[PDB]
Design a protein around this ligand. Structure first.
Ligand SMILES: Cc1c(C(=O)NS(=O)(=O)N(C)C)cc(-c2ccc(Cl)c(Oc3cnccn3)c2)c2cc[nH]c12
Ligand SMILES: Nc1ncnc2c1ncn2[C@@H]1O[C@H](COP(=O)(O)OP(=O)(O)O)[C@@H](O)[C@H]1O
Ligand SMILES: O=C(O)[C@@H]1CCCC[C@H]1C(=O)O
Ligand SMILES: [Cl-]
Ligand SMILES: [Cl-]
Ligand SMILES: [Mg+2]
Ligand SMILES: [Mg+2]
Length: 258
């Protein structure tokens, strides 16, 4: 249906693991969008061509204002192209790099936006599994949009960058469910307030140990309400982590959001 000739290509929006994302405009309608371009040779070498059909099938069926839209896709002799909704205000990653930390009001708003998007995903048994600032994009109003369904699966799953946002069960290569995103949500809340994720380290080895042990500390400026929500989400036991309804009703969230 679609072909590369139907789009004028702009600057790159970001480097991908298997290609690049470009700003682009559909020639007929003048629709601005993001074109995620993946090399067929690189996907085959990694043996992830199946997981790519997964990212497409899962994302194309999600309709929520805090989830990034996938309008379609096509491919040619050497590449696969995913037609994405353009998020004009970039990543939460870049915002965190320039602001160092977010106040409690911005943090709780983002956590509410994420929790609502994740609630919708989990209702379809969808596990995102790659919830991190570089995959959290910003709409025209500054609203958070969950993106990069690259590692998305349906729950339960055993299917096996940094380990920073991964729970203990996904590391170790054990069976997992929707609770992996609740752990990730806790890592995000910490990072938003502190400026760095709680298990950050120099090596993959050291990060693995800290996640395994649930070894982290809060700087003194972290409030009692923030420590409570984070500590609740960062449980080694996935069953002990709260439901998203509980996150949305948490007093610190209701008091600082939105
Ligand atoms: C070789 C090949 C092919 C291939 O059939 N080539 S072809 O026709 O025989 N031909 C060299 C044009 C296809 C893929 C691939 C994987 C996943 C997706 Cl989502 C994808 O996108 C689609 C899939 N269906 C419809 C529309 N877009 C395409 C991959 C991935 C790595 N190598 C591949
Ligand atoms: N729709 C978009 N709008 C704006 N920037 C985007 C968009 N999609 C991706 N980007 C940028 O490109 C980067 C790589 O995209 P992503 O889909 O997460 O690729 P990968 O699967 O390789 O990590 C993002 O982290 C972001 O910086
Ligand atoms: O969209 C991609 O770049 C990839 C598709 C295949 C699985 C891994 C995935 C990723 O790195 O997010
Ligand atoms: Cl598979
Ligand atoms: Cl086809
Ligand atoms: Mg990504
Ligand atoms: Mg990805």
């Amino acid at each position: 249906q679609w072909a590369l000739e139907d789009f004028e290509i702009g600057r790159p929006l970001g480097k991908g693991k298997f290609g690049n994302v470009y700003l682009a405009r559909e020639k007929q309608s003048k629709f601005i969008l993001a074109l995620k371009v993946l090399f067929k040779a690189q996907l085959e070498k990694a043996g992830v061509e199946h997981q790519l059909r997964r990212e497409v099938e899962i994302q194309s069926h999600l309709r929520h204002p805090n989830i990034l839209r996938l309008y379609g896709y096509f491919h040619d002799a050497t590449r696969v192209y995913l037609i994405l909704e353009y998020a004009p205000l970039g990543t939460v990653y870049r915002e965190l790099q320039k602001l160092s930390k977010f106040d409690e009001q911005r943090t709780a708003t983002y956590i509410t936006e994420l929790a609502n998007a994740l609630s919708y995903c989990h209702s379809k048994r969808v596990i995102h599994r790659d919830i991190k600032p570089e995959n959290l994009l910003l709409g025209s109003a500054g609203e958070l949009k969950i993106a990069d369904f690259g590692w998305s699966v349906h729950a339960p799953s055993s299917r096996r960058g940094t380990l920073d946002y991964l729970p203990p069960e996904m590391i170790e290569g054990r069976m997992h469910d929707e609770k992996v995103d609740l752990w990730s949500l806790g890592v995000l809340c910490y990072e938003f307030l502190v400026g760095k994720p709680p298990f950050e380290a120099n090596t993959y080895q050291e990060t693995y140990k800290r996640i395994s042990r649930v070894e982290f500390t809060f700087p003194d400026f972290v409030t009692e309400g923030a420590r409570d929500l984070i500590s609740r989400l960062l449980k080694h036991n996935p069953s002990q982590r709260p439901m998203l309804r509980e996150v949305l009703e948490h007093p610190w969230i209701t008091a600082n959001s939105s």
